[PDB]
Design a protein around this ligand. Sequence first.
Ligand SMILES: CSCC[C@H](N)C(=O)OP(=O)(O)OC[C@H]1O[C@@H](n2cnc3c(N)ncnc32)[C@H](O)[C@@H]1O
Length: 527
Amino acid sequence: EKVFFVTSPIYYVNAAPHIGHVYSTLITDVIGRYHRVKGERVFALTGTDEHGQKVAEAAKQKQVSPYDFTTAVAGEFKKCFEQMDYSIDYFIRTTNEQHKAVVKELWTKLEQKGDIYLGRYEGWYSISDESFLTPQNITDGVDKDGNPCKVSLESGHVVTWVSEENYMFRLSAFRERLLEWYHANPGCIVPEFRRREVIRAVEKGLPDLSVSRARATLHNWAIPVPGNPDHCVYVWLDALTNYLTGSRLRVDESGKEVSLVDDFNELERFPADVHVIGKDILKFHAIYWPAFLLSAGLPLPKKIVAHGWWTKDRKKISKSNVFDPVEKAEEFGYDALKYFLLRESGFSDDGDYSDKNMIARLNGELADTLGNLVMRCTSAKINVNGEWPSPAAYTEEDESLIQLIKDLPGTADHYYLIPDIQKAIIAVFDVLRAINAYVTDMAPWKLVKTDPERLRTVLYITLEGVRVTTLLLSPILPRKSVVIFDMLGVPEVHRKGIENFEFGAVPPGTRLGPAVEGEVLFSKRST
Ligand SMILES: CSCC[C@H](N)C(=O)OP(=O)(O)OC[C@H]1O[C@@H](n2cnc3c(N)ncnc32)[C@H](O)[C@@H]1O
């Protein structure tokens, strides 16, 4: 047993944060959260990637030193993510000294086992992606200022030629072993098809990788290569090591580091259980990262979730679709927008954000299915005693609904683990819709007069239903799930832990929380 260790990719500090990074870190957060709700110990980890030519030149463009610039931008990121009301255990920065120590340690480790040598790289490169590309991965396209240039087929950004004496990691040595790892662990890359892509790529062949760069090129704004000040460590070998650094930092109550353990075992975090990333950076996480680790005698991660790219109104996120997530959060609600991001598309798909679409999913899932159920379920009209009634005899119809509620956890457990947050959300909302049909059917408004003894069995099942679903929706709706429980008057101990996935863990005679006359759970908006 280990600390469950979930990651978010650390982001380039060249520009303000947006929905893309909020999205990636939310997925990180939800996986971390669910596992905590399971009662497991967890370490979630978002951060910023600060070194390298991309950011270095981003600082030059804004007429200011990288030190001042990166600190400032990295600050916008901590602010955004604080306001997004997450629950991550650390915000890492590659400018941090303890990190640098680890990168140098890893570098040395790799050198030691003869898998780094001094070579050349003569080929293409995208500064904007800090990615080496082969000629097949570039095409003709327009420079800014209209000039003919070469653009990346992956990114679309400008690619410049590079002819440098660089340090080379022996990636080609590791293709057969990588291929075993992909096959030995047929669920280590999700969604499935993105796995297949990785395997096709590795099936063809791997060249050795340039893991250092000419100091000059980077504007001296990267971690030096050990034993050779003339070089700096490739931004990605630096950036990828952030996962190993967070696994070795010890953190205090204010979220600041205090110490860097010598060994990764001391904190029982490494290797990552889930590396949430974007499809755009798969090759580094699924080919490079594991290759480095094997070289160095380290463990490999368990799972890499590579997701799709958001767009707004089908047009791509605006360099020049203004998208402030914190405002859309203030507009519609923070849990509401978290939900929408997680529900509106799965990891296989390139989601398309639309205000009107979210108004729909708010008004017709959160408000009208979930919210609606709760408002009836807890009411002086139906629940005249404001308690949890004792169940009478169970109808077969009762037993059907219950079986759905008994099963619902085990199913969502798989989907959360896959991970597929979408097929875990619907899974719950299938059970919420059922619970709702049942109640319309049983007509408890009528039963309060005809058959109070039967109304006990109806109200109780509903309540336990609404409870087990809300419990399993916690990581999606962290703040509203607490409001739901408060209305239900569930004890705090029954809001966490697998013991409370059991049907009927809250016993009858439990008193409902106070009834506020205005209290609406989710607010129906204009179309
Ligand atoms: C070892 S980690 C080093 C990573 C490196 N520092 C880096 O890649 O920096 P970066 O800010 O350009 O990263 C872009 C990342 O943000 C998300 N993302 C961005 N745009 C998105 C969108 N439109 N939709 C969904 N997700 C998006 C997505 O996760 C993608 O990988």
